[PDB]
Amino acid sequence: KIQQNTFTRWCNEHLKCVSKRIANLQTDLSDGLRLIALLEVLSQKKMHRKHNQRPTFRQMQLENVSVALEFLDRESIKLVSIDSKAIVDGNLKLILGLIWTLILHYSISMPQTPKQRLLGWIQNKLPQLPITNFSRDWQSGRALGALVDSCAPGLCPDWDSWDASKPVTNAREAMQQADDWLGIPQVITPEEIVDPNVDEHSVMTYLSQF
Numbered sequence: 001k002i003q004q005n006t007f008t009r010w011c012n013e014h015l016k017c018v019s020k021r022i023a024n025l026q027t028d029l030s031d032g033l034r035l036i037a038l039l040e041v042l043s044q045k046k047m048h049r050k051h052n053q054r055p056t057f058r059q060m061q062l063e064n065v066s067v068a069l070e071f072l073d074r075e076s077i078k079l080v081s082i083d084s085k086a087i088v089d090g091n092l093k094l095i096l097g098l099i100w101t102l103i104l105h106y107s108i109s110m111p112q113t114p115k116q117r118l119l120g121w122i123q124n125k126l127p128q129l130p131i132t133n134f135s136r137d138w139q140s141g142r143a144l145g146a147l148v149d150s151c152a153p154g155l156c157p158d159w160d161s162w163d164a165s166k167p168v169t170n171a172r173e174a175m176q177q178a179d180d181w182l183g184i185p186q187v188i189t190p191e192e193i194v195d196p197n198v199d200e201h202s203v204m205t206y207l208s209q210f
Helices: 003-019 033-043 058-074 086-090 092-108 116-124 141-151 168-183 200-207
Strands: none
Touching: 003 033, 003 092, 003 200, 033 058, 033 092, 033 116, 058 086, 086 092, 092 116, 116 141, 116 200, 141 168
């Protein structure tokens, strides 16, 4: 559940700049309209072709999603196994992999591989810390404190003496500090990031905002 909530929150952050909001990622992207808004905001370009502004029936929703998927590879963004039907038809899995393809490109591989570049970026801000992964390391919440204090010393000066057993408290403080002072939106919540079962993708979507 966490990966969906996260990708959704992330999406919504970019759709704020156009006054649009996803509630349910399974349905809200199917007429192509919000997908196309999200691409235009991310890419900061406009679409290559005209699209249907009022996709009342299915064929227009397929034309819409196809405008979008032409743009994606007109931008040389490699796409993996996604087709117009996948989205129009509310296929939650290939919809989640679409969003991920976009997060990897625009959020991580745009500002060696992405996972590694981002991992390298973090090891550089935190050289005293043995960061190797995007799930266990962050569970104490203390590496968030260190990362947020690294970005702006004194935001979480005491991260090192933080109680490892109180993860949500640690991560909630580190993440509300980054929010208020670094403008880093909390696309993954504290409770979700320190969850024992969170995926590396959700965590990267968050930390990539640094």
